[PDB]
Ligand binder design. Structure first.
Ligand SMILES: [Ca+2]
Ligand SMILES: [Ca+2]
Ligand SMILES: [Ca+2]
Ligand SMILES: [Ca+2]
Ligand SMILES: [Ca+2]
Ligand SMILES: [Cl-]
Ligand SMILES: [Mg+2]
Ligand SMILES: [Mg+2]
Length: 432
C-alpha cells in the first residue's frame, strides 16, 4: 500500500495523560516523534491506517520503532515489500472513554506494536517527552486518542447585524488581530464552529481567541490551545432570528465590536443586547453529500490490481474557496446507506478532501487482503465516491479519492469510508 488507501481516522493524536499532541520534529513529517503543543501543521495530522500503519499528512511515512524491544519511535519510510512488516503495524488495546474539557466524548486506547506486543509510550509518567515503545503497564500515558471536536455546528462568514461587515483577520494569512471588514471572497473570513466551542479560521486553522486566558479583552486568531477562553457558546436566548451572540465560556462576555456602529476592532465585552453583538453565518447551500462505492475491478480466482487516481469532477474550477466550502459541507454530515455517519467519519472525510487538492497522484493498488483482514483470494476492488450539489447552480460535484475497499463480494461494501468491514463480504462493520 504505497498510500494509505483504507484509512480509519485522520486527526491529532493526543496523549490521554497530558493532552499534548504526538508530534514529528519540525514540519516535514519525517524524523523523531515526541510530545509537543498542538500547532495545526500537517505533520500532526495523524493517519490511522487500516493496514496497521500510522502515517501523517505532511509526508507518507510510518511510525516505526528504531530496533527491537524497548526502542525509540520515529516517522520513517514505510516498508512495503514483501509485505508491511509487523514492526510498522499497530493495533488498539484496552479502551478508556472520557469527556474532555470541551465537553466532547473521546475514546482513548493503548496502541500496541504487532511485532513486539509493546505499547506506544511516553517517557516517564506525566505524558510529556520522547515517544517510543515499552512494556504495557496500564498507566494513563500509554493511552492515546484521536481528538474529536464533536460535530461541526455551523460555518461560513460571520456578518454583523448592525454594520453588515464580516469578521476578518488583519492581513490575509488568517493570523493575528480580528476586526470588522467588508464581506469578501477571502478565505480568512471563513470560520467553522464545533460542539467543543472552538471557532476555527479556515486560512490558518487557528482559533478565535481572547488575549490571555480569562476571556476578557482583545479578540484575534491564535494557536488553538484547548483553553476555555477559546470556547464559545451561541445560545438561543441571545439570537434574533439567524443573527446570534457568541458568549465566551470563560468570561461569559459577548463577542463585541468597539462602540455601537459595528465597524471597528473586535474583542469581548459585557453583553448588552445591541445589534453589533450579533452575527449571522453566511454560506452557500450545498446538498448533504452521499457516499457510495464504485466497482474498479473483480477477479474471481485471484487478486485484483488496478490503477487508482484521486479525481474530482465539477463543472467549474475548484478554487481554494470551493474547497473550503465543500470541506465544511462534508464535515456537517454525510449519508451512507440511508444513514448518517459518525463524527470521526465526517471529520476524516473533510480532512481527506482538503488534502486531495494536489492532483491525481495515481498509484497501482493491489488487493492483498480483504478489508476485514484475511488474505484476498478472489473478489472485487471498490473506490469511494462522494457526491454533492451546489444548490444555487445545481452543479453536481463528484469526488473519487484514493480510498478503497477490497471485498469477497460483487455487492458493494456495506460500510462507510473510515469504518472497517467486519467480514470478507463486508456486510457489517466495526470501527464506526
Ligand atoms: Ca512538528
Ligand atoms: Ca511511560
Ligand atoms: Ca484579512
Ligand atoms: Ca487566549
Ligand atoms: Ca459594542
Ligand atoms: Cl488573562
Ligand atoms: Mg521518539
Ligand atoms: Mg481584535
Amino acid at each position: 500500500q504505497v498510500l494509505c488507501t483504507n484509512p480509519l481516522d485522520i486527526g491529532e493524536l493526543r496523549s490521554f495523560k497530558s493532552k499534548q499532541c504526538v508530534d514529528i520534529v519540525g514540519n516535514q513529517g519525517s524524523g523523531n516523534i515526541a510530545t509537543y503543543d498542538c500547532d495545526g501543521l500537517s505533520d500532526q495530522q495523524i493517519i490511522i491506517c487500516g493496514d496497521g500503519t500510522i502515517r501523517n499528512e505532511a509526508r507518507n511515512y510510518c511510525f516505526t520503532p528504531d530496533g527491537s524491544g524497548n526502542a525509540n519511535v520515529m516517522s520513517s519510510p514505510c516498508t512495503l515489500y514483501p509485505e508491511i512488516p509487523s514492526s510498522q503495524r499497530w493495533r488498539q488495546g484496552r479502551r478508556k472513554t472520557f469527556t474532555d474539557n470541551g465537553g466532547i466524548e473521546q475514546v482513548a486506547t493503548e496502541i500496541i506494536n504487532l511485532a513486539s506486543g509493546k505499547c506506544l509510550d511516553i517517557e516517564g509518567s506525566d505524558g510529556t517527552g520522547d515517544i517510543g515503545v515499552y512494556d504495557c503497564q496500564n498507566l494513563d500515558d500509554q493511552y492515546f486518542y484521536v481528538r474529536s471536536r464533536g460535530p461541526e455546528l455551523f460555518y461560513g462568514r460571520l456578518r454583523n447585524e448592525k454594520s453588515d461587515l464580516c469578521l476578518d483577520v488583519e492581513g490575509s494569512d488568517g493570523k493575528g488581530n480580528v476586526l470588522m471588514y467588508s464581506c469578501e471572497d477571502n478565505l480568512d473570513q471563513w470560520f467553522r464552529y464545533y460542539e467543543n466551542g472552538e471557532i476555527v479560521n479556515a486560512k490558518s486553522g487557528m482559533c478565535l481567541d481572547v488575549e490571555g486566558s480569562d476571556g476578557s479583552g482583545n479578540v484575534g486568531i491564535y494557536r488553538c490551545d484547548d483553553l476555555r477562553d477559546q470556547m464559545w457558546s451561541r445560545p438561543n436566548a441571545y439570537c434574533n432570528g439567524d443573527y446570534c451572540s457568541f458568549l465566551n465560556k470563560e468570561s461569559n462576555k459577548c463577542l463585541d465590536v468597539s462602540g455601537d456602529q459595528g465597524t471597528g476592532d473586535v474583542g469581548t465585552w459585557q453583553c448588552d443586547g445591541l445589534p453589533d453583538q450579533r452575527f449571522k453565518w453566511v454560506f452557500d447551500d450545498w446538498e448533504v453529500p452521499t457516499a457510495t462505492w464504485n466497482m474498479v475491478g473483480c477477479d474471481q480466482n485471484g487478486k485484483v490490481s488496478q490503477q487508482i487516481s484521486n479525481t474530482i469532477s465539477f463543472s467549474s474550477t475548484v478554487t481554494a474557496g470551493v474547497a473550503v466550502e465543500v470541506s465544511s459541507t462534508i464535515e456537517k454530515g454525510v449519508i451512507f446507506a440511508k444513514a448518517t455517519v459518525s463524527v470521526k467519519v465526517t471529520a476524516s472525510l473533510s480532512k481527506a478532501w482538503t488534502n486531495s487538492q494536489s492532483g491525481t497522484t495515481a498509484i497501482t493498488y493491489t488487493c492483498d487482503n480483504y478489508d476485514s483482514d484475511e488474505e484476498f483470494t478472489r473478489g472485487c476492488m471498490w473506490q469511494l465516491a462522494i457526491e454533492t450539489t451546489e444548490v444555487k447552480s445545481g452543479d453536481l460535484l463528484v469526488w473519487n479519492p484514493q480510498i478503497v475497499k477490497c471485498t469477497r463480494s460483487n455487492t458493494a461494501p456495506g460500510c462507510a469510508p473510515f469504518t472497517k468491514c467486519a467480514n470478507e463480504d463486508c456486510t457489517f462493520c466495526t470501527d464506526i
